[PDB]
Amino acid sequence: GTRQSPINIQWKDSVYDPQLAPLRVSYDAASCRYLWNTGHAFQVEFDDSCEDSGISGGPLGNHYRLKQFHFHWGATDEWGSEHAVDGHTYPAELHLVHWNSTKYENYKKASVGENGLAVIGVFLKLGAHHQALQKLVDVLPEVRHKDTQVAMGDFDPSCLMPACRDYWTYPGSLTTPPLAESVTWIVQKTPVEVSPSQLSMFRTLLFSGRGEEEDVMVNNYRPLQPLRDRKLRSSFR
């Protein structure tokens, strides 16, 4: 299709849009439920029972509810992110998936609908240990095989976001089947630091189920897609 993610964020294709209203991120930590191994990555699921939890502002016309968030990574610290800023890739990327509760009846419908999703991409980079992320890291040994899960309890995703909220925005798609073109992408310019050891833990999850050939979970990212005729906006000058 034409609008497919991920892409390569290049300085030259960006156009500041001074019309973008500031982005207001506010999540209810109490809405957290469980972490689990989807078979493609690990995800933290939230209870989206009609709550203020979610995002608004920016390129979004209305509030979108937090449904879940996952991570993408490589077999090495040298690559792993889905997006790339001017040819550069990071060791991992966080995807905070929100669904347009205003236009669609449910997440299953929004995810494949015309304006059903809004995802914030946050690049991860080696650096200082990350406290908030440790909570998650601490339960991964419980979810090695696909389909396995564990209960959670009060977690604020915002703790995984950079202080500076400058972003790039463009129309995209899911980077996993059905690959629907229903995503308004909000990619954050400023990466968040984590320690090698936190990242190494990621690489112990498995693509395979219980009692199957041990198939390690690495390089679970999708190849770069052409920008095409789409408009890549900058919230910053």
Positions at the binding site: 70, 72, 95
Contact range with Zn ion by CB under 5 A, out of 1-9, 59-67, 90-98, 206-214: 90-98
Is residue 184 within 8 A of residue 117, CB to CB? The reply is: yes
Buried b or exposed e, range 47-86, using 16+ CB within 10 angstroms: ebeeeebbbbebbbeebbbbbbbbbbbbeeeebbbbbbbe
Residue nearest Zn ion by beta-carbon distance: 95
Q: For residue 22, what are the contacts with CB-CB under 8 A and spacing of at least 6?
A: 57, 58
Q: Which of 38, 40, 51, 176 is catalytic?
A: 40
- Which residue has tokens 């920008």? 227
120 vs 102: CA distance, rounded Å = 18
Verify whether residue 175 is a known catalytic residue: yes
Task: Kindly tell me which of 65 and 95 has the beta carbon lying closer to Zn ion.
Answer: 95
Q: For residue 200, what are the contacts with CB-CB under 8 A and spacing of at least 6?
A: none
Q: Does 83 bind Zn ion (CB under 5 A)?
A: no
Verify whether residue 214 is a known catalytic residue: no
Verify whether residue 63 is a known catalytic residue: no
Smallest gap from Cβ 18 to Zn ion, in A, equals 30
Per the annotation, binding residues for Zn(2+) are 70, 72, 95
Smallest gap from Cβ 175 to Zn ion, in A, equals 6
Smallest gap from Cβ 123 to Zn ion, in A, equals 13
Q: Report the phi/psi class of residue 154: left, alpha or beta, with left for phi > 0 and alpha for psi in -120 to 50.
A: left
Task: Kindly tell me which of 153 and 178 has the beta carbon lying closer to Zn ion.
Answer: 178
186 vs 123: CA distance, rounded Å = 12
Q: Which of 95, 98, 130, 184 is catalytic?
A: 95
Give residues 91-130 in contact with Zn ion (rule: CB under 5 A).
95
2 vs 107: CA distance, rounded Å = 23
Q: Which of 82, 89, 169, 184 is catalytic?
A: 82
Verify whether residue 40 is a known catalytic residue: yes
Task: Kindly tell me which of 3 and 95 has the beta carbon lying closer to Zn ion.
Answer: 95
DSSP 8-state code for residue 11: G
Smallest gap from Cβ 211 to Zn ion, in A, equals 28
CA dihedral 56, 45, 140, 25 (to 10 degrees): 10
Verify whether residue 176 is a known catalytic residue: no
Task: Kindly tell me which of 70 and 165 has the beta carbon lying closer to Zn ion.
Answer: 70
Verify whether residue 95 is a known catalytic residue: yes
Element (H, E) at 66: strand 64-73
Q: Which of 70, 83, 98, 130 is catalytic?
A: 70
Smallest gap from Cβ 183 to Zn ion, in A, equals 10
Binding residues with Zn ion: total (CB under 5 A): 1
Residue ranges binding Zn ion (CB under 5 A): 95
> What amino acid positions are annotated as catalytic residues?
40, 70, 72, 82, 95, 175
